[PDB]
TrEMBL record, chain C:
Disulfide bonds join C101-C164, C203-C259. The keyword Acyltransferase does not apply. Keywords: Disulfide bond, Glycoprotein, Immunity, Membrane, MHC I, Phosphoprotein, Signal, Transmembrane, Transmembrane helix. The chain holds residues 25 to 300 of 342 of the full protein. It comes from the Eukaryota. It is a single-pass membrane protein; Single-pass type I membrane protein. The keyword Disulfide bond applies. GO terms for biological process: antigen processing and presentation of peptide antigen via MHC class I. One of its GO terms (cellular component) is MHC class I protein complex. This is MHC class I antigen.
Length: 281, 9, 276, 98
């Protein structure tokens, strides 16, 4: 059975580029392409693609559910079984929906979060896609209530594979593979179980047009610190003389603050939160 | 008896 | 005597040729007893030895859940490795893990393991004290910091001292007639002449279990440590193993040479001498 | 990336005797990475229905596999064909009943 794949991604903007490859008999050999609704009717009047089909610029005509068959000369039919299916979804065909996380984007390891996609546009389906993932976007039917259509995607139990940058999309009836422009991205972070750091303030949590800097430090070797106000900031950690690793976030000229440690090359997983600290103005 | 392998690199 | 349980897993990315593949296998001593293969149709841990086949359904549900969890963790670790080593997403890479434990004759814990390789090279390993980690390069040094910040060695220590040893002891009893057996080698010698002045003496050992064995050649007493062609011990396919050792001898001197066979199945080690 | 070419051993499960049912084994070991193509050949032709063990590896992380099939030997030349990334051409090892 040939292995079909889209590169770099099956979710692709109109005007972008995507390559369909058909790997069969240790070769990306000669192959023909088929779409759903065409079944055993080869697309492009039976074009026998040679190496890999570069669709560029991508148009809405490239959207579809594709399978390939590869050349098999010493065979009865001369060709191979149909490959696995690859769904090319073309984005940028409607105005973007909105994406928000309930209760919020910071998710304790093992827990759950709802990513709600919604729009004033009446989308029949919504898709949720984590950036850089080859998995099929998750698909749900749009529910209609009070001038908006929406869909609640349940994410969890939370872990590193589910953290990252998410976008959601809408599509309308009869063109399901033609997706909207992506929603504004939402970063979903898994917190724990790394050891929570400590939060402190300079000169202190009591200020009245005065400036304050909040220090987040730890014995664990965090490379990054993240300061969160209940009502988002990022800074590299510096090796201090206790061998501790600190970062100083200047705030001034209040709020309840927590901070989280983070490691190099791992931007979506943070420590347990520090204990809350209240800056009172 | 398998081990729970849950911590990523 | 002493015994061991090992789980070995291999994770392979193969962009454009297949989805990432995860294969795990469980052994007691030299005897495989389970497998899981992410590409196979069952998506279950499967028995690969008769004596585990009578484990109840809850065992297979529990083991399947854990090995699938491992599959997901190491397939994410492939992605992480690309970032740590600044490698491109087009290449194929290999991520291997081994964990398990040894027990002595008394069934008490002797050693535990929990270690990883990336592209055929040591990556990170749990130390003998089961409390600290050996990181083999700067990328694994990141993992070490994370794992220290998470205190994860505690969970490894708890598994190795309790669950792993408890399972090994249980399996040793389940498969006693096959795991605690000791099949001796059947031996013989072949002779082949190289020239008018040399010949090859090959000492053969077949049908033995476990796979541990010593074949050695001596000439008048001093063993030919660096003149003996040794072949890696190979599986016969029925649960026994085979090995041979050969030495090159001046024709007419075959009587000076003796092959020595040491194996736990032998009451007394064998001293074999070729004769026409 | 480290790369290790496979050692190859072609042999019979039991002492070969003409007319007697047996198993032909090709054991590949010490190789890395794990993708390998192994064929048992009979008079140069590929034998079907060949089974193989589950991928495993040794203490040095190098992989090993056993390929095997049922066969009745005859006065018919058997071999093993191994392809690997470390080999530009396939390696053929004949079975020697000697
Ligand atoms: C794509 O086509 C396959 C049949 O080839 C079908 O099973 C699959 O559900 C289709 N996917 C979608 C999203 O239509
Ligand atoms: C979707 O999730 C939101 C936030 O948790 C909730 O208020 C709403 O009732 C959910 N909608 C449906 C249809 O379940």
């Amino acid at each position: 059975k040939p292995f079909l794949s889209a590169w770099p991604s099956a979710v692709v903007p109109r005007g972008g580029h995507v390559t369909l490859r058909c790997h069969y008999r240790h070769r990306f050999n000669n192959f023909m392409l088929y779409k759903e609704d065409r079944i055993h009717i080869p697309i492009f009047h039976g074009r026998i693609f040679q190496e890999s089909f570069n669709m560029s610029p991508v148009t809405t005509a490239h959207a579809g559910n594709y399978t390939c068959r590869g050349s098999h000369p010493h065979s009865p039919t001369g060709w191979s079984a149909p490959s696995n299916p690859v769904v090319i979804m073309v984005t940028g065909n409607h105005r973007k929906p909105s994406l928000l996380a309930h209760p919020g984007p910071l998710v304790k390891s093992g827990e759950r979060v709802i990513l709600q996609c919604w729009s004033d546009i009446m989308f029949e389906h919504f898709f949720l896609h984590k950036e850089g993932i080859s998995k099929d976007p998750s698909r749900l039917v749009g529910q209609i209530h009070d001038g908006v259509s929406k869909a609640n995607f349940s994410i969890g139990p939370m872990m590193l594979a589910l953290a990252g940058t998410y976008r959601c999309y809408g599509s309308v009836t009869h063109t399901p593979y033609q997706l909207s422009a992506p929603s504004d991205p939402l970063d979903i972070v898994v917190t724990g179980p790394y050891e929570k750091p400590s939060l402190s303030a300079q000169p202190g949590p009591k200020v009245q047009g005065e400036s304050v800097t909040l220090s987040c430090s730890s014995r664990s070797s965090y490379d990054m610190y993240h300061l969160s106000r209940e009502g988002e900031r990022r800074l590299p950690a510096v090796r201090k003389v206790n061998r501790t690793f600190q970062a100083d976030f200047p705030l001034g000229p209040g709020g309840t603050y927590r901070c989280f440690g983070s490691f190099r090359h791992s931007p979506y997983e943070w420590s347990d939160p520090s204990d809350p600290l209240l800056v009172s103005v | 008896t398998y081990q729970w392998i849950i911590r990523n690199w | 005597g002493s015994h061991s349980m090992r789980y070995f897993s291999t994770s392979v990315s193969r962009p454009g040729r297949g989805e990432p593949r995860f294969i795990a296998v469980g052994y007691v001593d030299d005897t495989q007893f389970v497998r899981f293969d992410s590409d196979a149709a069952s998506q279950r841990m499967e028995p690969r030895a008769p004596w585990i086949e009578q484990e109840g359904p809850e065992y297979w549900d529990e083991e399947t859940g854990k090995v699938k969890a491992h599959s997901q963790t190491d397939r994410e670790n492939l992605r992480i490795a690309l970032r740590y080593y600044n490698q491109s997403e087009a290449g194929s890479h290999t991520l291997q893990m081994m964990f398990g434990c040894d027990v002595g004759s008394d069934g008490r814990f002797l050693r535990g393991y929990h270690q990883y390789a990336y592209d055929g090279k040591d990556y990170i390993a749990l130390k003998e004290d089961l409390r600290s980690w050996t990181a083999a390069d700067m990328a694994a040094q990141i993992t070490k910091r994370k794992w220290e910040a998470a205190h994860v060695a505690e969970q490894q220590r708890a598994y190795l001292e309790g669950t792993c040893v408890d399972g090994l002891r249980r399996y040793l009893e389940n498969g006693k007639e096959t795991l605690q057996r000791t099949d001796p080698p059947k031996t013989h010698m072949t002779h082949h002449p190289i020239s008018d002045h040399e010949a090859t003496l090959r000492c053969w050992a077949l049908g033995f279990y476990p796979a541990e064995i010593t074949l050695t050649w001596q000439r008048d007493g001093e063993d030919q440590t660096q003149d003996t062609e040794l072949v890696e011990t190979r599986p016969a396919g029925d649960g026994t193993f085979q090995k041979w050792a050969a030495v090159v001898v001046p024709s007419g001197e075959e009587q000076r040479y003796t092959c020595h066979v040491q194996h736990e199945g032998l009451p007394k080690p064998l001293t074999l001498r070729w004769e026409p | 990336m480290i790369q290790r070419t496979p050692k190859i051993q072609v042999y019979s499960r039991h002492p070969a005797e003409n007319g007697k049912s047996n198993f032909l084994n090709c054991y590949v070991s010490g190789f890395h990475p794990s993708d390998i193509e192994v064929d048992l050949l009979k008079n140069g032709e590929r034998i079907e229905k060949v089974e193989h063990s589950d991928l495993s590896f040794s203490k040095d992380w190098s992989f090993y596999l056993l390929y095997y099939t049922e066969f009745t030997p005859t006065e018919d030349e058997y071999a093993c064909r191994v392809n690997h990334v470390t080999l530009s051409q396939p390696k053929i090892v004949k079975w020697d009943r000697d």
